[PDB]
Amino acid sequence: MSLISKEELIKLAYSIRPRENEYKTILTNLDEYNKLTTNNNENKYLQLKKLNESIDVFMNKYKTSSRNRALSNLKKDILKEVILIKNSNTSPVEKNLHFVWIGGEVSDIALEYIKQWADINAEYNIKLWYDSEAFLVNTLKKAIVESSTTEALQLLEEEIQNPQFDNMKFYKKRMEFIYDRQKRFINYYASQINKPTVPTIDDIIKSHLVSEYNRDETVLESYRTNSLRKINSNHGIDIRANSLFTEQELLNIYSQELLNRGNLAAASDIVRLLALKNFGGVYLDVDMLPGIHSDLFKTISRPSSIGLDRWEMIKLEAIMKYKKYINNYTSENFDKLDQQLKDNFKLIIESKSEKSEIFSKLENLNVSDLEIKIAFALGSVINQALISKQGSYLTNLVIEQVKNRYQFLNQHLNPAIESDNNFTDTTKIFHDSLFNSATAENSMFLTKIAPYLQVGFMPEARSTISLSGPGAYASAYYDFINLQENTIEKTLKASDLIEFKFPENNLSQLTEQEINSLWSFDQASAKYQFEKYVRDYTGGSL
Amino acid sequence: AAIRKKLVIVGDGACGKTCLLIVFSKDQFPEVYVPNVFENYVADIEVDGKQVELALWDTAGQEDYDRLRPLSYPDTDVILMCFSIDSPDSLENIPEKWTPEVKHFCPNVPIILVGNKKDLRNDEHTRRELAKMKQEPVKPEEGRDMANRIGAFGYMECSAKTKDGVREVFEMATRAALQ
Ligand SMILES: O=c1ccn([C@@H]2O[C@H](COP(=O)(O)OP(=O)(O)O[C@H]3O[C@H](CO)[C@@H](O)[C@H](O)[C@H]3O)[C@@H](O)[C@H]2O)c(=O)[nH]1
Ligand SMILES: Nc1nc2c(ncn2[C@@H]2O[C@H](COP(=O)(O)OP(=O)(O)O)[C@@H](O)[C@H]2O)c(=O)[nH]1
Ligand SMILES: [Mg+2]
Ligand SMILES: [Mn+2]
């Protein structure tokens, strides 16, 4: 079905005044929508958006118009019409499972997590996306952070021994070296990248590590070829050979995260979007596990002691302890419970003969060609699991949110970076730029992106969320619901958001690997890490 | 409909602002970890016959964000000034850092003094490791006295883990915003 007819709106919006040109446009757009016989949902949505924009133009020019009454009601209709198109006709997603591991050799833990998915869903293609030119990025990051750690320890030699030493002073001091070294690498890269014998990222990294960090070339090449071999044997697919990057702007974003910042999670954020766009299907983080059978442990009642989150962890720990589907999976929390429950579990688990009787199959995940589903945690969105049809409008919206936020970040950050000051002074200039550009529309965003340079190297630096992560997804959701673009801080109500939830029964998020982020850490981990640094620095090594 | 009101939470780092916001907004306390989700806190509440939508703004209490905190302050309707019961140092900073900053940036905005982590006042480990630094947990009279000294609208204790007093905290903040 469609909206109200052209003549119906004329009727409903009758005035003494003659028809203003904006109103003629409104009627034309509404008609064109009604007369539209296109089975393409994107075309329908775009026509609706055009209509909505025309209405807005009218209601903003003639704010006192008597037509505003009806033009407001039609707007309420248009929203209802959006959902109507989304919910009406769904098909299953392309049966692709997308994973990303970039920057080095994929570990066996990740492979085992992927193995679970692939075993349960033998009909789905597994795509482990990697960058064939960037196997040494993690090595370079490791080298930079270790050099910086030693430099900061030696600097505060006289102080780190004091038990009342603030660890933040260590991390702040180290950041200065980290930034210096990042600049040095980037300047070298920028000089090397334009040689006639067009060098790869790995070539430049190798050269830089050999020159500046006393690394062995042969060892580095060995590691690189090993990484390539290992990933190619486990569903590996190269982003550089499948043309995921058509826009230079997206490649620039990806590269700035992969090279300038050494944030592999941010690079992953870009790649997953491009993959879901070009191919479609399901994206999963390497710390995500398939959903547990919906009522496999309903015979076992949760004790009053343990909360829900931990309860679920124990479930996983139990499964891994009696099935050994994944090597070296923890049992810490599972060990801390009485044999009454412990034994009970074992019976239920070992009773089942097939893996399918423990974990859930994805089978057909029915979605609309407009939408993208996202995982939920703490009643908010998180892009660790995604479902999207190829060329979905919403995915393109998210990609647009990312480009937009990177445009604003780079515009405000580039002058400071280029000033070639130390970390503090560059931060000062960047913050000044942010401060100067502050409005009541974007202030919360500026607060979030403020420690962008510190992400990965200092605790509580989680800017990635507001650039390439969940923040962009939430804004794109709001963008879509209200037929908008480039929304910054507007958010939806829960009822409107649950519409895009990743089915709970098809995902296990409380895995051992998830609780330890690979791109950020908190202050407690920073404290523990600093104490370990001091212990190992003072004790010596053999 | 509903009345829109802005709440901003301030206080020392680690005193439990984030967990409190999450507990109130989503009725969930993170027992294990805090996932890297999109941070947005909005809550509907009915107080004194009215229905109010509270926009909860979190802040970083650390000095690193001293110069950025003020971007969150404009158009604030109510401030939750927080301290942790298990951190006397946290309470001592209320009038050293937070009161002048809140006065300078949010003139005439009511302040609710919130003493967080109520469940640690009687905790054994807490008392033990506080005795080493020759300290003891904060008494309610200590907090009440501080509310009167700073001219706060009210004082309330809560425990985000047990959800004890959380509703009362936000209800009191709402009453302060409506006044
Ligand atoms: O060296 C690395 C490190 C990370 N990754 C990728 O980035 C992921 C991030 O996973 P994780 O370390 O668990 O990040 P989270 O802490 O779980 O953060 C969540 O919120 C962030 C907001 O951007 C996202 O980027 C994450 O995808 C999202 O799951 C991994 O799955 C990989 O895909 C790599 O490819 N190479
Ligand atoms: N015992 C107890 N611990 C808490 C409570 N609220 C928070 N915590 C812990 O204190 C830490 C700091 O909490 P957070 O909300 O991040 O404080 P913030 O630094 O002000 O954002 C968290 O890791 C919590 O586990 C509480 O009510 N009781
Ligand atoms: Mg916090
Ligand atoms: Mn994760």
Side-chain angles (χ1 to χ4, degrees), chain A residues 1-88 90-297 299-323 325-338 341-353 355-527 529-542, chain B residues 1-30 32-123 125-179:
Chain A
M1 228 214 261
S2 284
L3 293 174
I4 60 155
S5 85
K6 174 196 180 192
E7 285 286 343
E8 177 67 20
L9 179 65
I10 315 202
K11 204 127 37 211
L12 285 163
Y14 173 102
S15 144
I16 299 74
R17 258 170 299 199
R19 255 90 118 319
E20 319 76 331
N21 220 290
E22 298 76 12
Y23 182 62
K24 260 216 184 159
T25 305
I26 298 172
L27 292 168
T28 298
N29 292 335
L30 168 61
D31 203 35
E32 280 193 29
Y33 176 80
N34 286 314
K35 298 273 194 63
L36 210 45
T37 180
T38 325
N39 39 0
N40 185 218
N41 278 354
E42 177 157 315
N43 291 158
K44 279 164 134 158
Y45 184 98
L46 290 174
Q47 187 64 28
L48 266 183
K49 176 176 164 282
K50 185 192 184 169
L51 169 64
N52 196 242
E53 279 164 345
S54 56
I55 296 165
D56 279 347
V57 164
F58 186 93
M59 292 184 67
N60 280 337
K61 188 173 171 54
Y62 318 98
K63 295 196 183 65
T64 190
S65 196
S66 47
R67 310 186 203 270
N68 290 340
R69 202 212 193 45
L71 280 175
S72 152
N73 293 331
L74 183 58
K75 283 177 62 76
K76 308 206 162 181
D77 287 348
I78 288 169
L79 295 178
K80 291 175 201 152
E81 182 80 334
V82 172
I83 309 300
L84 261 189
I85 303 171
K86 169 197 183 265
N87 294 352
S88 288
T90 68
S91 43
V93 247
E94 298 78 0
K95 284 146 201 292
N96 291 320
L97 291 208
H98 300 272
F99 301 88
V100 172
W101 189 262
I102 281 169
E105 180 170 313
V106 55
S107 76
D108 297 344
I109 322 191
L111 279 194
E112 277 158 349
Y113 280 53
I114 293 166
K115 173 192 180 46
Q116 309 321 291
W117 290 96
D119 293 351
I120 297 308
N121 302 280
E123 64 276 2
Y124 278 71
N125 268 185
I126 310 294
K127 293 189 149 51
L128 183 46
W129 291 96
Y130 71 93
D131 187 350
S132 65
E133 297 181 5
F135 286 117
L136 295 179
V137 162
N138 271 319
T139 300
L140 165 75
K141 180 157 112 98
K142 192 219 199 70
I144 290 179
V145 173
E146 286 175 357
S147 60
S148 295
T149 299
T150 297
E151 303 295 328
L153 283 179
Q154 192 139 38
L155 180 59
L156 309 162
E157 186 88 37
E158 290 307 328
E159 308 179 38
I160 60 174
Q161 290 297 323
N162 175 13
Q164 217 58 39
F165 181 74
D166 192 9
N167 57 94
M168 215 42 224
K169 173 158 178 176
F170 159 78
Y171 288 104
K172 272 174 218 205
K173 274 293 161 156
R174 179 174 89 158
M175 193 67 222
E176 268 138 47
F177 297 106
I178 296 178
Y179 179 68
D180 217 281
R181 281 142 168 75
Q182 284 180 298
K183 285 206 296 195
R184 282 215 275 275
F185 161 68
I186 277 299
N187 297 335
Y188 179 64
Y189 167 89
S191 96
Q192 292 295 104
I193 199 47
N194 286 303
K195 285 187 170 201
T197 74
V198 275
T200 72
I201 289 182
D202 273 345
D203 293 329
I204 300 173
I205 294 183
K206 203 166 54 175
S207 188
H208 191 245
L209 283 167
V210 168
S211 173
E212 305 291 287
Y213 294 78
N214 217 338
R215 314 259 25 258
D216 192 281
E217 172 161 46
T218 302
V219 160
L220 285 174
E221 180 68 22
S222 199
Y223 178 83
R224 189 198 65 86
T225 64
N226 276 345
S227 316
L228 174 58
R229 235 179 60 159
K230 190 192 192 195
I231 195 138
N232 269 349
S233 313
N234 289 269
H235 317 284
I237 182 166
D238 180 19
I239 73 180
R240 303 266 173 178
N242 283 251
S243 316
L244 279 196
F245 292 91
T246 62
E247 305 190 34
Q248 187 70 219
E249 189 185 359
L250 279 163
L251 173 68
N252 284 345
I253 292 168
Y254 165 87
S255 315
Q256 98 181 72
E257 286 307 332
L258 168 85
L259 296 175
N260 299 66
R261 249 52 74 193
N263 192 337
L264 284 316
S268 159
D269 279 347
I270 308 301
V271 161
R272 67 195 72 192
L273 285 177
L274 286 189
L276 274 192
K277 165 183 187 156
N278 282 332
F279 285 80
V282 175
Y283 171 81
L284 297 153
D285 267 342
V286 298
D287 56 17
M288 291 288 101
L289 279 177
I292 313 192
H293 262 324
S294 320
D295 52 8
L296 181 96
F297 291 133
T299 139
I300 324 213
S301 283
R302 186 191 65 96
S304 60
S305 157
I306 312 196
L308 292 327
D309 293 6
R310 195 146 228 126
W311 180 237
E312 299 286 327
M313 305 218 277
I314 289 146
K315 295 186 171 187
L316 281 180
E317 285 176 18
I319 295 173
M320 307 324 298
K321 200 188 203 142
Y322 298 114
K323 273 302 165 222
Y325 287 141
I326 295 153
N327 285 35
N328 272 313
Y329 201 103
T330 181
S331 21
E332 165 200 319
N333 298 133
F334 175 92
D335 287 342
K336 310 191 135 172
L337 53 59
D338 344 36
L341 278 163
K342 156 167 332 202
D343 265 293
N344 204 343
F345 266 102
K346 181 216 269 218
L347 187 275
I348 303 171
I349 292 159
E350 251 163 344
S351 101
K352 295 305 190 173
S353 167
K355 202 178 292 181
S356 53
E357 300 176 339
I358 289 302
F359 287 110
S360 112
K361 283 158 78 46
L362 293 179
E363 271 145 359
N364 277 330
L365 307 161
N366 292 304
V367 297
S368 140
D369 41 309
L370 279 187
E371 70 170 318
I372 179 175
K373 311 277 196 184
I374 195 156
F376 274 50
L378 287 177
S380 325
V381 301
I382 178 169
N383 58 344
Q384 55 191 195
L386 302 174
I387 306 170
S388 177
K389 205 88 220 257
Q390 197 239 95
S392 98
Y393 179 78
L394 242 171
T395 299
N396 283 276
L397 277 188
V398 181
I399 300 168
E400 199 211 28
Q401 276 289 21
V402 164
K403 286 198 282 191
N404 190 57
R405 316 175 164 239
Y406 269 88
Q407 193 266 128
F408 182 89
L409 171 70
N410 286 329
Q411 201 154 44
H412 290 81
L413 179 66
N414 281 334
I417 298 286
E418 284 153 16
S419 80
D420 198 53
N421 288 125
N422 62 199
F423 174 72
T424 300
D425 294 341
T426 304
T427 299
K428 250 291 301 189
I429 302 173
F430 172 55
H431 290 186
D432 281 349
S433 197
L434 286 194
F435 206 93
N436 288 161
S437 307
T439 83
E441 275 87 35
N442 72 8
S443 290
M444 174 151 27
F445 175 73
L446 308 184
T447 299
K448 287 311 193 157
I449 62 169
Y452 171 74
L453 288 179
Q454 303 160 215
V455 176
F457 313 106
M458 292 222 227
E460 308 287 67
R462 304 190 157 97
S463 300
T464 299
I465 293 176
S466 302
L467 291 159
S468 65
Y473 290 77
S475 275
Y477 280 136
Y478 179 91
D479 269 357
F480 165 79
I481 282 306
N482 300 287
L483 309 104
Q484 291 296 317
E485 274 175 347
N486 304 309
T487 281
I488 317 146
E489 286 179 9
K490 310 261 192 46
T491 51
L492 296 155
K493 48 165 162 178
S495 94
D496 265 334
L497 200 48
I498 292 160
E499 269 224 334
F500 308 92
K501 192 182 189 182
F502 193 104
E504 184 170 310
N505 49 348
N506 272 139
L507 189 60
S508 317
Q509 306 169 251
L510 271 303
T511 76
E512 174 191 14
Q513 283 295 301
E514 162 78 333
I515 86 158
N516 296 287
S517 161
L518 292 159
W519 66 278
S520 77
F521 51 102
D522 61 7
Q523 222 144 54
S525 308
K527 222 244 198 168
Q529 176 71 255
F530 168 80
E531 289 159 356
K532 167 147 171 52
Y533 278 146
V534 173
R535 274 190 298 273
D536 302 337
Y537 182 82
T538 309
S541 44
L542 308 184
Chain B
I3 300 177
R4 305 130 30 82
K5 286 295 170 187
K6 174 177 188 167
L7 178 145
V8 172
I9 196 168
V10 304
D12 272 346
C15 69
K17 307 186 291 294
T18 305
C19 281
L20 176 67
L21 284 194
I22 291 159
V23 159
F24 177 63
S25 40
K26 336 247 103 148
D27 197 331
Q28 280 166 265
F29 180 86
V32 186
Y33 85 127
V34 180
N36 287 328
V37 304
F38 174 58
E39 301 108 345
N40 205 92
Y41 316 104
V42 161
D44 299 314
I45 187 172
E46 185 179 1
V47 175
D48 292 325
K50 328 229 146 276
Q51 184 95 40
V52 162
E53 199 176 57
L54 279 175
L56 319 173
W57 296 54
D58 204 354
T59 63
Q62 311 92 5
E63 321 271 358
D64 253 2
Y65 319 74
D66 259 22
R67 217 265 256 130
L68 307 153
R69 213 146 43 245
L71 282 180
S72 323
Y73 282 145
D75 295 306
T76 297
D77 289 310
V78 62
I79 281 148
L80 291 182
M81 192 168 297
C82 292
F83 71 83
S84 186
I85 290 304
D86 71 321
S87 182
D89 300 343
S90 69
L91 174 53
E92 148 188 335
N93 241 31
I94 290 293
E96 298 277 350
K97 178 182 193 175
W98 299 113
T99 315
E101 168 163 308
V102 154
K103 176 178 194 292
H104 184 235
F105 295 119
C106 321
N108 255 242
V109 172
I111 294 153
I112 309 291
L113 191 54
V114 192
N116 296 321
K117 315 189 197 186
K118 184 192 179 73
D119 59 288
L120 297 184
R121 167 177 291 142
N122 301 143
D123 178 53
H125 176 213
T126 304
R127 284 209 203 270
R128 294 202 279 108
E129 274 194 19
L130 273 177
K132 304 285 277 174
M133 271 270 195
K134 319 198 89 85
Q135 285 174 351
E136 80 180 39
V138 173
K139 308 175 202 284
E141 313 67 32
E142 280 155 18
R144 200 182 306 138
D145 176 68
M146 191 64 81
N148 290 132
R149 282 170 142 248
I150 64 173
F153 180 88
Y155 175 70
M156 201 50 200
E157 299 179 346
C158 73
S159 172
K161 195 174 46 136
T162 75
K163 207 189 144 80
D164 179 37
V166 174
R167 144 92 181 184
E168 278 81 358
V169 163
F170 287 94
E171 170 183 276
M172 182 188 293
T174 306
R175 283 192 179 116
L178 285 172
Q179 167 169 133

